[PDB]
RNA sequence: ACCCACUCGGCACCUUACGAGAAAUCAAAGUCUUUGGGUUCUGGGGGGAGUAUGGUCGCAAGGCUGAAACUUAAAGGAAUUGACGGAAGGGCACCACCAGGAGUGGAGCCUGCGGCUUAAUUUGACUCAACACGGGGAAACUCACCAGGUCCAGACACAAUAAGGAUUGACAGAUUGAGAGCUCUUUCUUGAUUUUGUGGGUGGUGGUGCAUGGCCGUUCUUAGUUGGUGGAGUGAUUUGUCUGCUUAAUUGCGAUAACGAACGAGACCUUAACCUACUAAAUAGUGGUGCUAGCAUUUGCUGGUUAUCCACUUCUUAGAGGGACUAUCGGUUUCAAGCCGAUGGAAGUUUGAGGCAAUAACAGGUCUGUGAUGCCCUUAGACGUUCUGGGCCGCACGCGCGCUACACUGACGGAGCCAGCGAGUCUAACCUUGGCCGAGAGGUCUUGGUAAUCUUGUGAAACUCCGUCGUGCUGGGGAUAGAGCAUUGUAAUUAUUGCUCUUCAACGAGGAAUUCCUAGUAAGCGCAAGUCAUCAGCUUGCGUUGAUUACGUCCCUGCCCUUUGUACACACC
């Protein structure tokens, strides 16, 4: 046939990072708990899921993307 | 045509370790038994076989 | 000298074979396991090798005598069937010729193959039997090629990671051809579905048609194949199955150690022909009747009217039958098979044309039709797959199937106006009548049709009629090119197709060559179907108009069949 070429730079994939996430949550000295990151007002994700914080940006990931609530 | 009426054909590829062989089988069914068809080959010309005659016996005639 | 009978002794030939042989054959090669008349000579698997050595003869060349080591499972004989032959003899055929027809070959373009060119210009196939073939008419698809971008749709087993998250997804931005979270920035989300590693699978239009199945082409426009009982041969084998004659045919007659049969050919089946006979039909038609138009009037003539009724089955349709068997007679011939002629006949060329088609052969083609397939390759920076764009069409040229022509048997313009095989729309946009608009292409409103019911009488084209042109590359010819309008499609640029105007080439009948063809055939002519969203200069069929010339031959070519040679049998590659 011919076999092989390439200008190098082979592509990777993804990582899904790591983290130990949901520390985001704050309970005062015994034991009242206050939520960090405001939740989601779409009835497909009953306020359990959260909005990420970028710029302008507050974003429901559970909604695989959908809707842009910005406050 | 008698082909169509009488001989059954089939091919079947049997698929063994080495390669594959075809099987071809051909059965010719007795045209005699044919039931709902021609009862014989278009070749088949039977003659019906006469009968010994004991002739003469000068005229005469019977009455009823 | 000659003739006839005889007899010795010669050179031979003939037929037989009691007999002999492995056979071919042999009056000796006979009188041999029923083995002995006398006598000479030579041989003991093949190769080494008539070699080396000695001896001896010779002027010489060489002669006579004449080993071994080693190597080796066959060399060899006669006959059989084949296969082959650049032998001989017979045949068969418009993919052979004869007599001709229409041409191809020359031209323009269409189209395939080569070649070159190319990022790629995917590839198979190369005499008949590769080259308008792969149903191959590729704008995406198809698609295999090239430039790049995604996805796993990586079964299953184990192991590893891991509920403190194994893994999944993504908005905007960046990025990208791209409103692909491909990747990256950011940081939510998902919850044991994956991920990683190994084994093991899987896909592939990757290889191999020289590993296969299946199909298919070719031999083959052919006539060959085999068994029963009998004849021959130790035998494999032969004879039957053949000189001749006849036929398209191993089709028959005949001759005959053969007789009588089977596969194949024929029969058979399908289609085109003929039925005033049979059963019928408002999805086929005819006559009469009304309702009715026109013209003529003296009754007439020419239409209208999916039912206003009566009847019929010639025409149309398709069930069942019939019909032809080369019949009658006559010529010819082994007076056999047949063949030829005349009359009759719907039909008398296998009635015309096809469908089927024995045994065998080929390294024919096809892994690129197949979720038919062996093995090899490859398998996540994929040869899997999908997405974007280009490519198969790229152009100094060689070749092949075609298309349109060079005109006056014509072009052009009116006008008459006639076929047949088809095909058509459900969970849908197929075939299209009719009315408008538009020069045209087309549009738009409706409409019948799942169809003998509607398109459609498919009013097709050649063709026939009256004109214009008048031999001038002309009003023949329409290549090449411009400008516009339209249809298909997500997409038309490298111009899908259609129309309008203009532009107006080559070509004045084509060198050597070479194709196809014998009657509703050739040729001319259009249509339908396949393909298909759009595109036929292609093909599969169809019908219309309708000839000239054979009705012979073996000269060329091709292939059969004998004879024959063979040291070939993997069979002349
Ligand atoms: Mg003998
Ligand atoms: Mg011999
Ligand atoms: Mg000739
Ligand atoms: Mg000529
Ligand atoms: Mg593509
Ligand atoms: Mg794996
Ligand atoms: Mg592996
Ligand atoms: Mg495959
Ligand atoms: Mg082959
Ligand atoms: Mg094959
Ligand atoms: Mg090959
Ligand atoms: Mg012929
Ligand atoms: Mg015997
Ligand atoms: Mg013979
Ligand atoms: Mg009738
Ligand atoms: Mg006549
Ligand atoms: Mg080959
Ligand atoms: Mg195949
Ligand atoms: Mg091509
Ligand atoms: Mg061809
Ligand atoms: Mg005209
Ligand atoms: Mg207009
Ligand atoms: Mg001109
Ligand atoms: Mg013209
Ligand atoms: Mg068409
Ligand atoms: Mg084609
Ligand atoms: Mg021989
Ligand atoms: Zn949400």
From Swiss-Prot, chain A:
There is a cross-link at residues 26, 32 (Glycyl lysine isopeptide (Lys-Gly) (interchain with G-Cter in ubiquitin)). A zinc finger (C4-type) spans 40-63. It comes from the Eukaryota. The modification Phosphoserine is found at residue 41. It is found in: Cytoplasm. Component of the small ribosomal subunit (SSU). Mature yeast ribosomes consist of a small (40S) and a large (60S) subunit. The 40S small subunit contains 1 molecule of ribosomal RNA (18S rRNA) and 33 different proteins (encoded by 57 genes). The large 60S subunit contains 3 rRNA molecules (25S, 5.8S and 5S rRNA) and 46 different proteins (encoded by 81 genes). Component of the ribosome, a large ribonucleoprotein complex responsible for the synthesis of proteins in the cell. The small ribosomal subunit (SSU) binds messenger RNAs (mRNAs) and translates the encoded message by selecting cognate aminoacyl-transfer RNA (tRNA) molecules. The large subunit (LSU) contains the ribosomal catalytic site termed the peptidyl transferase center (PTC), which catalyzes the formation of peptide bonds, thereby polymerizing the amino acids delivered by tRNAs into a polypeptide chain. This is Small ribosomal subunit protein eS31. The chain holds residues 82 to 152 of 152 of the full protein.
Swiss-Prot record, chain B:
Ubiquitinated at Lys-51 in response to stalled ribosomes. Ubiquitination leads to activation of the No-Go Decay (NGD) pathway and degradation of non-functional 18S rRNA: first monoubiquitinated at Lys-51 by MAG2, followed by formation of 'Lys-63'-linked polyubiquitin chains on monoubiquitin by HEL2 and RSP5. It is found in: Cytoplasm. It comes from the Eukaryota. There is a cross-link at residues 39, 51 (Glycyl lysine isopeptide (Lys-Gly) (interchain with G-Cter in ubiquitin)). The modification Phosphoserine is found at residue 60. Belongs to the universal ribosomal protein uS3 family. Component of the small ribosomal subunit (SSU). Mature yeast ribosomes consist of a small (40S) and a large (60S) subunit. The 40S small subunit contains 1 molecule of ribosomal RNA (18S rRNA) and 33 different proteins (encoded by 57 genes). The large 60S subunit contains 3 rRNA molecules (25S, 5.8S and 5S rRNA) and 46 different proteins (encoded by 81 genes). Component of the ribosome, a large ribonucleoprotein complex responsible for the synthesis of proteins in the cell. The small ribosomal subunit (SSU) binds messenger RNAs (mRNAs) and translates the encoded message by selecting cognate aminoacyl-transfer RNA (tRNA) molecules. The large subunit (LSU) contains the ribosomal catalytic site termed the peptidyl transferase center (PTC), which catalyzes the formation of peptide bonds, thereby polymerizing the amino acids delivered by tRNAs into a polypeptide chain. Present with 146000 molecules/cell in log phase SD medium. This is Small ribosomal subunit protein uS3. The gene is RPS3.
């Amino acid at each position: 046939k011919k076999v092989y070429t390439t200008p190098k730079k082979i592509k990777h994939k993804h990582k899904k990072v790591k983290l130990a996430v949901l520390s985001y949550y704050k309970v005062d000295a015994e034991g009242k708990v206050t939520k960090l990151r405001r939740e989601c007002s779409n009835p497909t994700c009953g306020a359990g899921v959260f909005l990420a914080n970028h710029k302008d940006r507050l974003y429901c990931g559970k909604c695989h993307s959908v809707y842009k609530v910005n406050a | 045509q008698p082909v169509n009426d009488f001989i059954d054909t089939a091919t079947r590829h049997v698929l063994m370790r080495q390669g594959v062989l075809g099987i071809k089988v051909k059965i010719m069914r007795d045209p005699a038994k044919s039931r709902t068809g021609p009862k014989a080959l278009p070749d088949a010309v039977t003659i019906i076989e006469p009968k010994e005659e004991e002739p003469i016996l000068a005229p005469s005639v019977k009455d009823y």
